[PDB]
Design a binder for this molecule. Sequence first.
Ligand SMILES: Cn1c(Cc2ccc(C(=N)N)cc2)nc2cc(NS(=O)(=O)c3ccccc3)ccc21
Lengths: 27, 252, 10
Amino acid sequence: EADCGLRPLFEKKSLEDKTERELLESY
Amino acid sequence: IVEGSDAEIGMSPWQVMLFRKSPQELLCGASLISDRWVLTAAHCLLYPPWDKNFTENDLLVRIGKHSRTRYERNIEKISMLEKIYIHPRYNWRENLDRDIALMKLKKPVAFSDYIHPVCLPDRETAASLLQAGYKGRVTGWGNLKETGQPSVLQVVNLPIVERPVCKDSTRIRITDNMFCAGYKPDEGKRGDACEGDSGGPFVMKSPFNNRWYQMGIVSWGEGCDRDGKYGFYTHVFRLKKWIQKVIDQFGE
Amino acid sequence: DFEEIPEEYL
Ligand SMILES: Cn1c(Cc2ccc(C(=N)N)cc2)nc2cc(NS(=O)(=O)c3ccccc3)ccc21
């Protein structure tokens, strides 16, 4: 899917959810 | 989910609820990967030990939900199943090896702010993200305790564990088509999937293209959030070949 | 405790 993995209420409007940074920091 | 927290609205637009018609009940978790294909665990449909062998007509797929028990009017979309596909080498006899299955919806579902497909990883994405320590996210309306029912979709971030550790934690034969995640006893933090979350998605957000990828499927676990135990998940990429065939074969 | 869903889907 070309649009896969991009959330309408988050990535699509450049808003991040409350805990995704925890994920990024683990990488 | 044990030790998680309420999901934010639209936080997991690909979360799918496997719902049993009679009696109406939560059957399992699952994921939307396109407008007509839903991914889930094979045992959610087939598992003789527990007298489970559902057919298309016994199931219903609920997409775009937040609330567990309530019918979310104007938000969720209920789909009927056209055909179920279970991996040909799914080992339900021994260790649930290749615990994966596909469900083709009768009609495509309309995407929205609350409904949106997740990506399936490619070799490279899997290679660089599926490492010990790297955290993934697991969601579901499953139980909050090993032994309790959530009102809202739950979510928890969990670290992938070194294969040796996974194996040394159980007597069950672990395979490359599986990986385990969770906090070690000394790490302090905790959390895990639980009954009802099964079939659900283990996702990771690529730091390379900022997209969400489903690396695993909630497969099995001994109890829920027990010290020394870890949740095990189906390795999506290692089975993507099968996924491709199904879709590039019977796929509309 | 699952709210009734539109019987149309049934
Ligand atoms: C579908 N399923 C599940 C679902 C499941 C998945 C995850 C979790 C969890 N992370 N706490 C808890 C439960 N648990 C099982 C536990 C068993 N018992 S087992 O651990 O002995 C086993 C493992 C693998 C193959 C056969 C039997 C069998 C099936 C199971």
